[PDB]
Write a protein that binds this ligand. Sequence first.
Ligand SMILES: *[C@@H]1O[C@H](CO)[C@@H](O[C@@H]2O[C@H](CO)[C@@H](O)[C@H](O)[C@H]2NC(C)=O)[C@H](O)[C@H]1NC(C)=O
Ligand SMILES: *[C@@H]1O[C@H](CO)[C@@H](O[C@@H]2O[C@H](CO)[C@@H](O)[C@H](O)[C@H]2NC(C)=O)[C@H](O)[C@H]1NC(C)=O
Ligand SMILES: *[C@@H]1O[C@H](CO)[C@@H](O[C@@H]2O[C@H](CO)[C@@H](O)[C@H](O)[C@H]2NC(C)=O)[C@H](O)[C@H]1NC(C)=O
Ligand SMILES: Nc1ncnc2c1ncn2[C@@H]1O[C@H](COP(=O)(O)O)[C@@H](O)[C@H]1O
Ligand SMILES: *[C@@H]1O[C@H](CO)[C@@H](O)[C@H](O)[C@H]1NC(C)=O
Ligand SMILES: *[C@@H]1O[C@H](CO)[C@@H](O)[C@H](O)[C@H]1NC(C)=O
Ligand SMILES: [Ca+2]
Ligand SMILES: [Zn+2]
Ligand SMILES: [Zn+2]
Length: 722
Amino acid sequence: WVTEACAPQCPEGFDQPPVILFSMDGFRAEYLQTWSTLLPNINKLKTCGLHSKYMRAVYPTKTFPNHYTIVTGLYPESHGIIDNNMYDVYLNKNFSLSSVEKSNPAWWSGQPIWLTAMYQGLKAASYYWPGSDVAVNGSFPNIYRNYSNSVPYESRIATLLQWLDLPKAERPSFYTIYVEEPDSAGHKSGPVSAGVIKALQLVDDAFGMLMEGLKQRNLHNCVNIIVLADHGMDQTSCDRVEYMTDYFPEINFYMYQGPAPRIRTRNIPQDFFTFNSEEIVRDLSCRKSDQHFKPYLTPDLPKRLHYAKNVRIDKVHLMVDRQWLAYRNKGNCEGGTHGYNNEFKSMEAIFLAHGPSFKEKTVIEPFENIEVYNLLCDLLHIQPAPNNGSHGSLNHLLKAPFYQPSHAEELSKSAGCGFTTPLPKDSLNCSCLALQEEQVNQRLNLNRGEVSATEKTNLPFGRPRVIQKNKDHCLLYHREYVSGFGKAMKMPMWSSYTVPKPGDTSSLPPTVPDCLRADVRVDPSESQKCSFYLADQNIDHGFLYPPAIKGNNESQYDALITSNLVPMYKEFKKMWDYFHKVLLIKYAIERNGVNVVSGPIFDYNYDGHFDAPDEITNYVAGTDVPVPTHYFVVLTSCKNKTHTPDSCPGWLDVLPFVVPHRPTNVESCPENKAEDLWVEERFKAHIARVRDVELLTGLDFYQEKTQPVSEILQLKTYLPTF
Ligand SMILES: *[C@@H]1O[C@H](CO)[C@@H](O[C@@H]2O[C@H](CO)[C@@H](O)[C@H](O)[C@H]2NC(C)=O)[C@H](O)[C@H]1NC(C)=O
Ligand SMILES: *[C@@H]1O[C@H](CO)[C@@H](O[C@@H]2O[C@H](CO)[C@@H](O)[C@H](O)[C@H]2NC(C)=O)[C@H](O)[C@H]1NC(C)=O
Ligand SMILES: *[C@@H]1O[C@H](CO)[C@@H](O[C@@H]2O[C@H](CO)[C@@H](O)[C@H](O)[C@H]2NC(C)=O)[C@H](O)[C@H]1NC(C)=O
Ligand SMILES: Nc1ncnc2c1ncn2[C@@H]1O[C@H](COP(=O)(O)O)[C@@H](O)[C@H]1O
Ligand SMILES: *[C@@H]1O[C@H](CO)[C@@H](O)[C@H](O)[C@H]1NC(C)=O
Ligand SMILES: *[C@@H]1O[C@H](CO)[C@@H](O)[C@H](O)[C@H]1NC(C)=O
Ligand SMILES: [Ca+2]
Ligand SMILES: [Zn+2]
Ligand SMILES: [Zn+2]
């Protein structure tokens, strides 16, 4: 097989292709790009089959959370396996790899792919995989093996080949096979060592034995084989470890140490919820100038990580820097480890695929492991259980896709806010001493041609659709921007505008000061008052669309209205204004103009979904105007920089941000530091996917882009990395 040339040849009985999911623990993407030619069996798979540049793991980049994510399509917060070592307060039990509690089904939520196949009339076998030797939802796979780490790889392969030799009635359609290397070697001697080379050669022989075994049965081109990893590997040093003794005079708390630390009380379960989590994060914030970790209260963590909505995830979290460690005391440190941020290049996993369903000799762009579950379902011809993968985003991997995706149906239609009179019925305690005749409101009145012109420029991919039931809203059209106004919350849900490529940075008009007026289109009962922000001293009004970004002085008046106001904390406003005044211009030059869609996010229950009106817990003092938890900024331009975003036929380039709306900038540590040294760093830290923005807002983007839904899903699941 290994010497044989590249190839739907299935023998008698095999009507449907069998699916084999092969995991090689800690096989980082870097190992494939550098050492592939030293591994002839995996190199043939790379040459003949399909492979991604890398597969993004889930945070924390550990074995049990990631392996269970691959088979469920769920984030650790939803499936429950948040770490290899964890504690549940309600169960009052400790979970570990060396404990009996790992076999308790109470810890395992969701529906793994073996159960999905079993519930839909197919048989499933497994030679190891976290959760496969556990009676998840009161059921084990048809054939499974109780975990035993030292069983030789040949014996694991031989038993799997016996299962493929079984009669059609007994023969499973889905298979899992797990291997401990090159993770074990990575921990021992580091990612770039002789130990990992030997381990990579060992896993290549194991894969070679499987492929040669399949070739004898004439199943080498029949079987839909997937070779992947749970996470990557990085180098650790005893000279690169932060100690909690250097920050606290006395440690009375419990700490889950390493690359993804979690802090809780020692007095469990009595002091669990009582524990001052907010004190720990405050006492660890900006303590040292060259601090190699950042404390976070779980709802404040970057939204793209989706690591907060679970009782097992302790409120205190530490985001450890590349190649560093965080321990309780100075009293293992050498070699290598994983568990760090999934965006780190060293944490990237491998993904290779071969079979009749997969495209041959194909290199695909990086994707996330949460997407694998839907692909496994399409391969097995089964309906997927509710998961976090975008069904259809992985269709470019298949020769003939099983599922055809469609755009999310709009649940609420736009109504009202039409121009009737240029005279305001209510002043709303707003003042602009510059206006003289106030007939500038005639510019807010746009004819069918004027509306189409701004819809062509500022809405090139179509208006974001409202995927919310009974959401009273209207579209507000202006010559420089278009917004979707939320009537009940008295602010816009989204504001879309395409800034063209600017010429010079030196000559830039400032925002018209002390000028604010009522929008004649929106009813005063559905509008914000300027007096609302005078009463509340902590929050002030902010502009969602920057008035001075487009046109002239007369164009600014179209944005100096009550409908363009959003509640903002003074400290957040410093980041918001700097981004639109300095960073946005810089980005607009780099990608030949940029389309911006901005708006508020409400996620008080930190579940990654948009809040229902009853879920919002903070409002503008003495008013029903809600306070956003986050603000989104989705930058869209074209992949081919020769075209502007408003006039482009090819693929689009996206840069989404989900920035927390916090009263302080303690996350950035900006003490005696100008905005040019921390604002961009803070925005880049809170980069997310378009899908993340979509779930947090109940909006759906790019529904009017002439491209298949499957291709638009690739753009929506894309995570920009720097
Ligand atoms: C995996 O290990 C478990 C636990 O040792 C085995 O389950 C026991 O099987 C016996 C006989 O079928 C039952 O009487 C017990 O009730 C089971 N549970 C326990 C906790 O003892 C299981 O059979 C093993 N599976 C394989 C494939 O070897
Ligand atoms: C889970 O493991 C932790 C850590 O070993 C145990 O924590 C101890 O709990 C007692 C109270 O029950 C405290 O007085 C100790 O200070 C804790 N020790 C540490 C090191 O944190 C906990 O009891 C275990 N729980 C179960 C149910 O096994
Ligand atoms: C990931 O997918 C799961 C499953 O669809 C989502 O969890 C469900 O959320 C609803 C609403 O909060 C609950 O009623 C269900 O009980 C949850 N199911 C499970 C299995 O946990 C989860 O919200 C999704 N996450 C994101 C960020 O979209
Ligand atoms: N199903 C399992 N049950 C118990 N331990 C396991 C299982 N699968 C893997 N392991 C262990 O987890 C280790 C990898 O975990 P990690 O250190 O997080 O990369 C392996 O070397 C095994 O010893
Ligand atoms: C658990 O199994 C039952 C059938 O026995 C099924 O109806 C249910 O949906 C399953 N739940 C999960 C989370 O897989
Ligand atoms: C970009 O578009 C131009 C046409 O405007 C075309 O000539 C060029 O080849 C395109 N480049 C890429 C990389 O697609
Ligand atoms: Ca929510
Ligand atoms: Zn692992
Ligand atoms: Zn490991």
